[PDB]
Amino acid sequence: NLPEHWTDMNHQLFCMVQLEPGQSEYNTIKDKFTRTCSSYAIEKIERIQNAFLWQSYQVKKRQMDIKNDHKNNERLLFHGTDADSVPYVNQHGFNRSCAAVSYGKGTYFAVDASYSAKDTYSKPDSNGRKHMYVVRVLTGVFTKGRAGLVTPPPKNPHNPTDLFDSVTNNTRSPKLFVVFFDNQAYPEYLITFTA
Amino acid sequence: NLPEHWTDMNHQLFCMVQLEPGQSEYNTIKDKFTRTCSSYAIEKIERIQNAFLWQSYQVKKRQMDIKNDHKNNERLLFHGTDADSVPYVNQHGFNRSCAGKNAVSYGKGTYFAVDASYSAKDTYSKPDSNGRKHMYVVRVLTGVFTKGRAGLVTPPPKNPHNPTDLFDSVTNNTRSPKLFVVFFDNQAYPEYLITFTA
């Protein structure tokens, strides 16, 4: 069930694990951030070990891999948010009802960390600290979004219930993805950083 | 694991199974419905076999059973809706983003009734062009609940100083619950569709 690179949780179901700087896992996540956010300062990176969220996400992944007849449904994306939302996300994941929604009423994830690093998203807290998640997202098969969507559009108007898995701003060169269901996104790392 | 009493679906992921009057499965739902809806008549009752919705719901049930202390977390409730919504609900379940505002709101979520008479109101089970009304019978993970409030977009915390440890659902009245509101996907499994008429 639980991934191998997680560390022991003494039979508990939720833990935030601060990563050791200079080790492979920390370097890998840092690199993905610094590709576009090298002018920022990383204070720490934490691994989110939430067993319930992981289980519900992996079930949805298995289902999407069956539905789409392929296994290229996952992307690693970024989500900046304010400090007041961090405890909720760690415990409960991403909730579209807490959403601003130009491509649909869902949760938004950025291809580039620099987009999530905007102060409108990763709002600096009273100490100047900014917060950004690295997220496993089941983008699956996607189409262009539009304002007012509550679910992705149907793949074909002849079967209105067979839906795209997510929407984007631009199908040829996406920079953001919107997902409309719980447990289509697993918050995997939390980056705390400053400008 | 899919229930062993379901029909074989030939590797398919979804199907609706028409029940036979006289079988206990049909009669128990009929009795539950007629307890408060004796003036209506049932056309048919279909068992909803949706493999993916069942799996995700059963995962949430197992998690709530773990988290809560030997609590009966699941109730069998009713949900009236319009014909236009039946194909989506059958396939994808109950989406709070599509829910209507209830005439007495205890939160912005999906509403489920204890009494079929409540879901039988035309405001919920809107008659279609042929006069058919539609009501789901739903397994709902009500869990541990409290009285809701109109402003809620998620269940409230049990403890104001631990805002992320939430009630599982809310109700109109904890002493005499008649409706429940849920705020998350896969917290309710549409198990039967009742088609009925006046």
Ligand SMILES: CC(C)(C)c1ccc(-c2nc3c(NC(=O)[C@H](O)CO)cccc3c(=O)[nH]2)cc1
């Ligand atoms: C609720 C508060 C704290 C105000 C908030 C607001 C926006 C985001 C947020 N938004 C994103 C986004 N959003 C848009 O492109 C437009 O809002 C759509 O019209 C695109 C790509 C990535 C992100 C992203 O990482 N976080 C997080 C939190």
